[PDB]
Symmetry: C6
Subunit: 125 residues, 6 copies
């Protein structure tokens, strides 16, 4: 069987930080994986030895939180969840650009354990 | 003895993603499983080795959430729970079959697996 | 030592779904057990190999929830918990025998196993 | 090392049901233990093999809940906790008698995982 | 590598009850521990074998609860948390030393271990 | 693989308390690590034997809580979470350098490790 985790960072030595089984770990990738093309926040597949053997895409289901503000660094956002839970999360690539821009009350799909926002979910009317 | 999980996806090599023991796993299927006939969201039965040995029905008990909108893709929906927790979930076939659905419909959901399975009269 | 679980369903092949050690399992009964006399929601005792070796009484302590409606199938009910969490649960065999509210009855429930066991006014 | 659990019932065959490590189990007692004198709801000590090797007393710290009503059987009570959480619990012996009697709004020390009430905690003024 | 727990009691045979890894355990002490000098509620350091190897100070971070009353025994107190969860906890020495305390004082507590350790100005 | 933890304290014997895999541990540093340069609250990397092999940056994502007061010791603060949960946390090294509210500042916290790391207005 394989498990999965959320990619957090790629190091100069081609190891990666991944959030998996509820904790951050530094893991190695299979030689066939091009680490230069990994996208932070994407789900990655792990073998039993915890080597990254495949890159997937971003989570498509889960918690929604409301955007309050993108932080000064342009990399993280302050979001507000259901019971008034304020949190900081990383912006995945499709959100960090900038064409469109993120505006406060935008609804964002988030993983608050890994600390990532993946997708904006549109429309009241 | 067998365990269970919620089927999430089927891969080209006949392995499947399943949500079981609180996380997503990629698992193999027994010779009896024709993956072509699997329905996403259904419960699957797992042997000790975590091989899928039987494909079952959708969950029938659990949390209730309220439908806010089906997303543009027609695959997912925005649902709101008891303390106004908004989530995105996948729609199982029975919900996609009617997609009416409104908006306010009460849906049986598994928020860990990320699925909505059944509409519950409020009602009737 | 023996473990325990809540009997969820009895299958046509005589195996049984049981909620035990925090998850749903499909288990086999000792030949001693007459599976046709098993009662939904009752506590079953397991040996170390997870064979069902004895069938017992129903859970008698735990969470109280309020009945909202008995579903159209007569097997499940919509209940509302203390913080307005709505859930669907199975009716244990004693409750599967009649009810009547909204249109309010207080039920002993185990939301992890997904069962209601007993009504709390003066009821047996 | 030893672990602990809450005694739930004593069987005719001298085995006992105990709530330990978050679940109910049927366990045996050391031959030196007189099972006839066990008190339901008391904490019991388990060796690594999960044999009951010692009986203790009732929990003395933990959750408080307010009594609503003793059930018709005289063995269980409906209690109401902080966030309006209603639950049924077993009455330990010092509470089941009957001299004094339990009255609704009494504060009770409870273990809502094992499903027991142990002690009444007195006095506003 | 060492773990930690909260000391709950000392036994006549020099073993101790400690709350560690989310539950109470009876553990032994190293030759260096003079159990006569232990203070109930203090943090203890445990080696891989779960032997107490060092007795430390009280916890300094964690949940805050409000004092309602010290119980008649002078050993325990009724405390109320954020969602008005009332609990009974043991008093550590520093709190017993002042027992003033009032009632309204804010106390640093570990509700799993069942201890109050320190009074926090509201204040100052 | 390597694990990670939050550095809680540095002891006079050069060992360090670290919150890792959901609990507090006392660990040893690789000889490479200058323990006098370690900074409270920083993330440390662990080998499989749980030796600290590298010291890193601070947590940058997670829960936001509101500062109520910096305690008299200048090392800890009282913070209030989203559901009015009050807690005492340690100040990470960057925050241990000044503050100022009630008499309101938003702090990034990890309540499991018991640390605040960063203030969120425009602050570095």
């Amino acid at each position: 069987p394989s498990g999965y985790g959320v990619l957090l960072s790629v190091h100069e030595d081609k190891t990666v930080d991944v959030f998996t089984s509820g904790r951050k770990m530094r893991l190695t990738c299979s030689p066939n994986i091009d680490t230069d093309t990994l996208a932070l926040g994407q789900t990655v597949r792990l073998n039993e030895a915890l080597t990254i053997v495949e890159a997937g895409t971003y989570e498509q289901v889960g918690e929604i939180s409301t955007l309050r503000e993108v932080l000064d660094d342009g990399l993280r956002a302050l979001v507000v969840g259901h019971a008034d839970e304020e949190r900081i999360v990383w912006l995945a690539a499709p959100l960090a650009a900038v064409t469109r821009k993120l505006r406060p009350g935008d609804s964002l799909l988030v993983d608050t354990k890994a600390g990532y926002a993946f997708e904006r979910i549109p429309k009241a009317e």
